[PDB]
Design a protein around this nucleic acid. Structure first.
Lengths: 79, 577, 449
RNA sequence: GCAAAAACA
């Protein structure tokens, strides 16, 4: 039952085992991000969510494919 | 209890779902399993004869017995050879397409099966390290041992593994690599040894049970025979594996007739069966359909191995001098299991006739299905493990009496022994019970043994949310849950999901969003939920950009393939840590 | 293929050969069998007799009250409680010595200073079972006498407690607050809106009740205790139980102290010292609790201290206790749909009269009060989940089915040696709620016309 | 003390 450990795992120091990267700062606004594979804090994905690298719109559309078609069949039907 | 029994505006059948100890700690077993294992072993030897004589039944190597010796007022262990032959022939008379399809299986793609997928098995006990190890490393160790003893590479096909085992066990002296040596007697003892273990997360009865697991060198045979059981059970209408209960209860009998329902369980379903009757069943069916002699050996070896089982006796019985407590193995000091002392083989014990949990759950069902097939038994029967339901259609009550009596006798013939106190018969049909499904009039009520977890699985936020949503969807589709229950469950799951990822209250992550001027945009981040009751199969990032709650810039930021961290219909994302 | 020694090696433990070829003629024998029997009187559940079974659970239940504290954080409330109160013992129990209060006051102060975890003190020694295994083993070795015999464990049979009905009627006390805060989901279609409205109406028909507050308190206590279990420690951890009313104030239900809890496996028992606020005290109901007087702002309270130890499985299970709300709502939901099935016109404000047997009389009662009944009894069953409960309940499902069948005018048939009453009885030993359900079933009529 | 088949402490 791994679900009994998530509470610790989320609260575990350096929850994420990070692939070694360079664009992610060691410390951002008085807060450690990575453990210089290396480990990373829980706030790193949220940091990437706003101050991370972007990609092509076509790549995004390809990645989100096979998940939208249900959305525009659910929102284009009459009940 | 009177609170659980309504009389107006609703019937007790629907509220019988309340007769379940949900949201409570499931019992967990402590200490030694020796007493339970010894009781499991000793029960079949105490029911072979009408008069209880354990010692006389210890030398019995075959559960073949006589009708006069069968106990009709209590449990009876054993079988009648001619009865098994006739019942197997009767079952062979009907259900021709299923037998034709298993012939297709055996002659087309049964050898196509491999041994790599056996890695998907349950925990094993390695016979070299003498330790409980997972299935994959056990399989690698087994194939390494086979290739270093057989002097040739093991083919991918499972039949290659079977021939490899058959050839390697004839090499007398064997060694693994350390340099752990073995002998022929040691290999046979490892074949005979069964690994008992407490059943965890078991609900439904006061007394705990012990489940067995076999060695990895016999799991191939047991899984191929279980597979044959599967593709003979999937295409017979009287099996318990599919909606069979609903379609069977959809019968509309004519008024000038009486239809009744029996719902029953089994007392000692794994302490009254001899593998020899199973052998005879398999051999008769396979011979009458046209299997060769090598198929005979291939499908009869697992029972050869099981008839000499050496299930471990846990860690020993419990003895107290004063306030002290010690675990003394059987035979060191006299106890209530002295009769089995002569059967003690080291840390194991010999048990020629018997059964254990976790071995054969579908071929026992096949034995029940062949048993129910008679001439006067003009009813419809559904079987699943230790539970059964039968529907009798006839004209007069005494016909019901004789049919049910001969059904009970026929089940006792092979050693099934349906529970006298757990079989309930109602002579007018309409309200039945089977497995976890009830039936009142025409409506059927599915009840889940376990409530939905309503908690993230722990892998990562989006996958856990997807699994929870899929679990809720599965629960509501089966009828176990409805609109209000589904919405309440998804609200509870949302609360647990938010709490588990520091999306509630004030914490380090919340301070991270606050100081960095990062407003929440996702459910795990702390934003308002977007999933509705009808949105069970919709993705997390979906329905957010469609409603305008997400901007494409942050979507490019998170959905960037060049991100340091990267059925589950979850889109890859940066938060999939 | 078949080997040489393979053949005999397989022979030794089977009378037949590897490939069985019996010479007996296949036939079905005729065996005389016992007589099918039919029943008139429903089984009467035998009632165990003896001392009444005391209360045993993670928390107190209906006797759970809270102290009102000025708005602020957990630390401010704990500091206010510690600095504006004095403790004197009222009732002393040998199971929970008075000295453990020194532990609690040691934590209330320490948590008030930003130290949720504090160093060990002497009174902690007998507070969490520290070095108790060594004590017991050495004492038994020194006092060992006689000769080894079988363990022969037994469980004492205890009768129905007198406090079960007061519990069952006290969980229904009306409350000024909703005590349930669940985030509303989005609505996009009509059926989803109907489901959300049903869940709402459920919330404010079962929210302003004492049982909802008790469930919330249990959830908070179990969650806070479980959040501090994984981190292996050797120092006492403090987990206050404080909620927030919808007016800004603080509600102090109690406080649980977690010992060293050097846990290894998934089922080890972490020690706990639980202090809670009571409304009334009872001798035979809390024999293992120590009762102290609490004075806050010329206001009287009772503080119950209990020494216990629970596994991580039980604490995690009770951390998700809110799921107990699912079972009653279903009924209500079904009833609502039932009314829909009557007219295809849903209302959301239907209160049909449900007819039940109360004190041996067939009488009607409101749907909302019945749903409160159900929620309270489900909570009581959930907090008292033991193998006796599950065995009795599973074996009682069959009797419930038979009773329903007799209500709808059908005959039930039983085998010769059929005694379902025994297979329902063997699970009735000392469980209070099991005995309560047994008494409730027995009070109902047994012969139906 | 917690459990329930001798476990933890």
């Amino acid at each position: 039952a791994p679900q009994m450990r998530l509470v610790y795992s989320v609260r575990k120091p350096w929850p994420i085992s990070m692939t070694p990267s360079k664009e992610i700062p060691l410390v951002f606004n008085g807060t450690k991000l990575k453990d210089t594979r290396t480990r990373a804090n829980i706030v790193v994905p949220d940091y990437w969510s706003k101050y991370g690298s972007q990609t092509s719109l076509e790549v995004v559309n390809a990645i989100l494919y096979a998940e939208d078609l249900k959305v525009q069949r659910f929102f284009s039907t009459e009940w | 209890m009177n609170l659980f029994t309504p009389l107006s505006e609703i019937n007790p059948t629907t509220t019988q779902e309340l007769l379940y100890a949900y949201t409570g700690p499931a019992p967990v077993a402590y200490g030694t399993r020796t007493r339970a294992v010894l009781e499991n072993i000793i029960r079949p030897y105490q029911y072979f004869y009408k008069e209880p004589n354990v010692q006389r039944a210890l030398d019995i190597k075959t559960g073949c017995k006589e009708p006069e010796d069968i106990n009709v007022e209590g449990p009876s262990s054993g079988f009648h050879t001619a009865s098994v032959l006739k019942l197997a022939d009767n079952f062979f008379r009907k259900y021709r397409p299923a037998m034709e399809k298993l012939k297709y299986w055996i002659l087309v793609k049964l050898p196509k099966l491999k041994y790599a997928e056996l890695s998907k098995g349950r925990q094993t006990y390695s016979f070299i390290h003498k330790r409980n190890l997972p299935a994959p490393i056990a399989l690698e160790e087994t194939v390494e041992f086979l290739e270093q003893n057989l002097r040739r590479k093991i083919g991918p096909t499972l039949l290659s593994y079977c021939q490899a085992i058959a050839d390697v066990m004839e090499l007398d002296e064997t060694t693994y690599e350390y340099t752990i040596k073995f002998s022929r007697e040691e290999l046979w003892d490892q074949m005979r040894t069964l690994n008992t273990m407490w059943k965890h997360l078991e609900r439904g009865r006061l007394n705990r049970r012990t489940i067995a697991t076999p060695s990895m060198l016999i799991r191939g045979f047991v899984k191929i025979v279980e597979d044959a059981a599967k593709e003979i059970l999937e295409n017979v209408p009287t099996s318990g594996v599919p909606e069979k209960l609903a379609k069977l209860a959809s019968k509309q009998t004519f008024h000038t007739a009486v239809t009744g329902e029996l719902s029953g369980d089994q007392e000692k379903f794994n302490e009254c069966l001899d593998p020899d009757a199973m052998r005879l069943m398999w051999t008769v069916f396979l011979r009458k359909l046209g299997c060769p002699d090598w198929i005979m050996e291939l499908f009869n070896i697992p029972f050869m191995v099981f008839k000499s089982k050496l299930a471990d006796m846990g860690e020993g019985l419990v003895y107290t001098k004063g306030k002290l407590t010690d675990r003394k193995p059987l035979g060191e000091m006299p106890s209530e299991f002295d009769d089995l002392v002569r059967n003690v083989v080291g840390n194991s014990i010999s048990c020629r006739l018997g059964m254990f949990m976790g071995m054969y759950n579908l071929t026992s069902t096949l034995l029940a299905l062949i048993s129910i097939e008679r001439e006067e038994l003009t009813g419809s029967h559904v079987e699943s493990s230790d539970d059964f339901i039968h529907f009798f259609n006839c004209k007069t009550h005494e016909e019901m009496f004789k049919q049910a009596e001969t059904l009970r006798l026929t089940l006792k013939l092979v050693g099934i022994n349906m529970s006298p106190s757990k079989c309930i018969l109602i002579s007018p049909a309409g309200i039945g019970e089977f497995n976890s499904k009830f039936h009142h009039r025409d409506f059927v009520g599915n009840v889940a043994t376990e409530l939905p977890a309503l908690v993230p699985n722990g892998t990562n936020p989006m996958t856990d949310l997807a699994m929870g949503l899929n679990v809720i969807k599965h629960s509501v589709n089966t009828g176990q849950m409805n609109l209000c229950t589904g919405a309440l469950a998804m609200r509870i799951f949302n609360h647990a999901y938010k709490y588990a990822y520091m999306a509630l209250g004030v914490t380090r992550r919340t301070r991270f969003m606050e100081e960095n001027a990062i407003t929440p945009l996702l459910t795990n981040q702390g934003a308002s939920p977007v999933h509705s009751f009808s949105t069970m199969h919709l993705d997390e990032v979906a329905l957010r950009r469609h409603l305008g709650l997400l901007d494409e810039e942050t979507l490019r930021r998170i959905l960037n393939p060049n991100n340091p961290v990267t059925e589950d219909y979850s889109v890859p994302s940066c938060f999939k840590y | 293929s078949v080997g040489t020694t393979f053949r005999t090696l397989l022979k030794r433990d089977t009378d037949w050969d590897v490939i069985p070829t019996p010479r007996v003629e296949p036939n079905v024998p005729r065996i005389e069998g016992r007589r099918w029997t039919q029943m008139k009187k429903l089984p009467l559940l035998k009632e165990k007799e003896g001392p009444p079974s005391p209360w045993r659970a993670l928390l107190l239940g209906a006797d759970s009250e809270y102290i009102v504290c000025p708005p602020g954080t957990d630390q401010e409330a704990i500091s206010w409680i510690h600095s504006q109160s004095e403790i004197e013992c009222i009732r002393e129990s040998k199971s929970t010595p008075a000295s453990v209060i020194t532990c609690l006051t040691s934590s209330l102060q320490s948590f008030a200073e930003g130290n949720p975890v504090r160093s060990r003190i002497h009174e902690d020694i007998i507070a969490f079972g520290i070095n108790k295994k060594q004590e017991k083993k050495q004492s038994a070795s020194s006092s060992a006498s006689g000769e080894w015999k079988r363990a022969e464990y037994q469980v004492e049979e205890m009768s129905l407690p007198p406090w079960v009905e007061e519990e069952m009627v006290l969980l229904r006390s009306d409350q000024e607050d909703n005590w349930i805060e669940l985030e509303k989901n989005a609505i996009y279609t009509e059926v989803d809106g109907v489901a959300e409205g049903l869940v709402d109406k459920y919330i404010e028909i079962v929210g302003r009740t004492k049982v909802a507050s008790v469930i919330e308190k249990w959830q908070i206590a179990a969650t806070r205790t479980f959040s501090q279990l994984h981190t292996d420690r050797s120092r006492i951890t403090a987990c206050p139980i404080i909620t927030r009313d919808p007016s800004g104030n603080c509600q102090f239900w109690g406080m649980v102290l977690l010992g060293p809890h050097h846990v290894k496996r998934d089922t080890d028992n972490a020690p706990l010292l639980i202090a809670e606020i009571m409304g009334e005290d009872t001798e035979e109901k809390y024999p293992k609790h120590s009762v102290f007087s609490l004075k806050v702002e010329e206001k009287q309270f009772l503080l119950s201290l209990k020494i216990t130890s629970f596994s991580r499985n039980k604490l995690y299970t009770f951390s998700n206790i809110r799921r107990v709300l699912i079972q009653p709502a279903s009924i209500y939901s079904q009833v609502v749909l039932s009314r829909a099935a009557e007219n295809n016109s849903l209302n959301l404000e239907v209160n049909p009269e449900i007819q039940l047997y109360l004190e041996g009389a067939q009488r009607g009662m409101t749907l909302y009060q019945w749903v409160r009944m159900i929620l309270c009894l489900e909570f009581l069953m959930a907090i008292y989940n033991n193998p006796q409960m599950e065995g009795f309940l599973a074996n009682m499902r069959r009797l419930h089915m038979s009773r329903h069948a007799m209500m709808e005018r059908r005959q039930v048939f039983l085998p010769f040696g059929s005694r379902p009453e025994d297979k329902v009885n063997e699970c009735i030993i000392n469980n209070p709620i099991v005995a309560y359900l047994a008494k409730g079933w027995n009070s109902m009529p047994n012969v139906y016309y």
